[PDB]
């Protein structure tokens, strides 16, 4: 019955994305410098998230330290020792009073910023990979046991359990409307869910390997994907077809983190060639190389106002580029 | 004084060497997630046994890039289950994110192997040894792993075979000596001597 879907998508193929972007000038060369260098981490780090106030960020490391820093002064405001050394995700709440963490310990710990642990979520059988805050009451988590879960922190029980994946789920992204969220997994398929309906809406299969990162466009009607086959693809929600393939023949390495800017013109991606890339989201052309790390980049985050970007690799160094 | 309290904890990160344990269900990993700690020669080792996740291991094993050593324990008595151990050893040895660190190899329940052989591989017949039967069987089991371990990546990391049973009690000194040799070669590389 999917052959009819393929025929409908072939009939929907009117023109390429680059056919409609001909009548505009390209961006050109985009270069940045390391304004701040953060050296307070001992071991390798895995995850990072920017706050909504664009001043404080949080970094998660594998030595058991969750450090909330100050980006302006390059100094730590909080340093929490973790119960389990192995973590893979973190997120800083939009209200700024909470920060979450999770990893191989099968616990989604929530930390209050008003430092001790607030509550400990235990409903997942696999390792957590990505968690993001809807509000201060409800949180969406994803684990490697093919399950996403909507948690209510006030009761600590799952509201909706999203089970539509066959491979291990790596990342999720939140829409600006805070009503839908797209999630990517290790089965070359990323798909959209409704938090209210509790069911999948659309399924997108365009890649050839494991999806490692995903991010929404600022208008909420598109998303870019990053996978291990050294390619990126831009998908539209309404069209449900591949728009552009940001791929190069000189890269054969994986992609671990992607993020969008405020305008959405510059798609920022973290690769496995010990360096990040910036992409024109319309021209599908290379704009510049972000090479400042001695190890493989594991986290990458762009502020909402777009005035800075933070980037980390497993060499225990966080770098702000601007 | 937040940064002053971290540096002492830095010593707590540096004096302790972490170990990653694998194997199967039949191999005696417990008698040699789960966490254990043991101090030998006033040096603390802290060994991990991940057993709460799924059978797919191509993603979370990237968490163990910076661990000191991987203890791979192999069931040797049941001959039908060696080929899975060979395939797991080849996949571990040929991994991109695991090629720097080294594997200490334990071949468990040797007394059960002796009791079984005193009662699959077509190249066993044309093999000579480098109570006489058990030596040929043991070094066949050793050499089938060592041809994989010396097939590629010999310069970056090494394999340390060990023959042990479930009634052994001296594996702590042996893993201490293996870790001492591994970190000694790493220090000789780091100090511009070799």
């Amino acid at each position, epitope marked *: 019955l999917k052959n009819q879907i393929r025929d409908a998508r072939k009939a929907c193929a009117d023109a390429t994305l680059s056919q409609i972007t001909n009548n505009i000038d390209p961006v050109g060369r985009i270069q940045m410098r390391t304004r701040r260098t953060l050296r307070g981490h001992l071991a390798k780090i895995y995850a990072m998230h920017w706050g909504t106030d664009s001043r404080l960020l949080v970094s998660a490391s594998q030595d058991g330290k969750l450090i909330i820093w100050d980006s302006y002064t390059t100094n730590k405001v909080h340093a929490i020792p973790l119960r389990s050394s192995w973590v893979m995700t973190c997120a800083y709440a939009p209200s700024g009073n909470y920060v979450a963490c999770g990893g191989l310990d099968n616990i989604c710990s929530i930390y209050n910023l008003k430092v001790r642990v607030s509550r400990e979520l235990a409903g997942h059988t696999g390792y957590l990979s990505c968690c993001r805050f809807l509000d201060d009451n409800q949180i969406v988590t994803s684990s490697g046991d093919t399950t996403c879960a909507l948690w209510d922190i006030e009761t600590g029980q799952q509201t909706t359990t999203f089970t539509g994946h066959t491979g291990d789920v790596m990342s999720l992204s939140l829409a600006p409307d805070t009503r839908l969220f797209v999630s990517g997994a290790c089965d*070359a398929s990323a798909k959209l869910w409704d938090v209210r309906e509790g069911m999948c809406r659309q399924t997108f299969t365009g890649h050839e390997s494991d999806i490692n990162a995903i991010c929404f466009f600022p208008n909420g009607n598109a998303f870019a994907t990053g996978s291990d086959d050294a390619t990126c693809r831009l998908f539209d929600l309404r069209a449900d077809q591949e728009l552009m393939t940001y791929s190069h023949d000189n890269i054969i390495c994986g992609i671990t983190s992607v993020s969008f800017s405020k305008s959405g013109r510059l798609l920022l991606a973290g690769y496995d060639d010990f360096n990040c890339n910036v992409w024109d989201a319309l021209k599908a052309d290379r704009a510049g190389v972000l090479a400042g790390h001695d190890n493989r980049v594991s986290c990458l985050g762009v502020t909402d106002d777009g005035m800075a970007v933070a980037t980390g690799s497993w060499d225990s160094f966080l770098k702000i580029w601007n | 004084g937040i940064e002053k309290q971290l540096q002492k904890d830095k010593q707590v990160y540096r004096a302790t060497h972490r170990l990653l344990l694998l194997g199967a269900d039949n191999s005696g990993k417990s008698t040699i997630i789960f966490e254990t700690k043991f101090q030998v020669d006033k040096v603390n080792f802290h060994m991990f046994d991940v057993g709460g996740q799924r059978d797919e291991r191509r993603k979370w094993i990237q968490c163990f890039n910076d661990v000191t050593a991987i203890i791979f324990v192999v069931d040797s008595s049941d001959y039908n289950r060696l*080929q*899975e151990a060979l395939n797991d050893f080849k996949s571990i040895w040929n991994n991109r994110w695991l090629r720097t660190i080294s594997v200490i190899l334990f071949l468990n329940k040797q007394d059960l192997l002796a009791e079984k052989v005193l009662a699959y591989f077509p*190249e066993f017949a044309r093999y000579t040894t480098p109570d006489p039967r058990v030596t040929r069987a043991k070094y066949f089991i050793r050499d089938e792993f060592l041809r994989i371990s010396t097939a590629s990546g010999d310069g970056r990391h090494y394999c340390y075979p060990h023959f042990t049973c479930a009634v052994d009690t001296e594996n702590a000194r042996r893993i201490f000596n293996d870790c001492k040799d591994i970190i000694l070669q790493m220090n000789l590389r780091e100090y511009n001597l070799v």
Partner: nanobody, 115 residues
């Protein structure tokens, strides 16, 4: 969309939806009453070829990129070979763990072969 379809005594596995000469492919079998077991592997260049010792020196595994399919040739069969035969692919290109797994996303549904 990735899709692996088996047929077949010569086995033919058809692969589509992804680039063919950048992945290392595997053959695995599922005999009833037990778990899965690896049979043979083939690299991108077709040079590094290994087999299980129980079936070594008997089977002929091959890959052609122009036809975009994988072939396996059998002679002098045994009654122990009655199993379901999956063609598998470990996911990382230019390189391999989870092909012998309970649930996998890059292998077919398999065909039953009995002598």
């Amino acid at each position: 969309q990735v899709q692996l379809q088996e047929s077949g005594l010569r086995l033919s596995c058809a692969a589509s939806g992804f680039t063919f000469s950048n992945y290392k492919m595997n053959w695995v079998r599922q005999a009833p009453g037990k778990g899965l077991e690896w049979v043979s592997d083939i690299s991108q260049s077709g040079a590094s070829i290994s087999y299980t010792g129980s079936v070594k020196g008997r089977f002929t595994i091959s890959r052609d990129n122009a036809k975009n399919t994988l072939y396996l040739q059998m002679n002098s069969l045994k009654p122990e070979d009655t199993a379901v035969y999956y063609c598998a692919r470990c996911p990382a290109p230019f390189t391999c763990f989870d092909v012998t797994s309970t649930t996998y996303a890059y292998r077919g549904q398999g065909t039953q072969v009995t002598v």
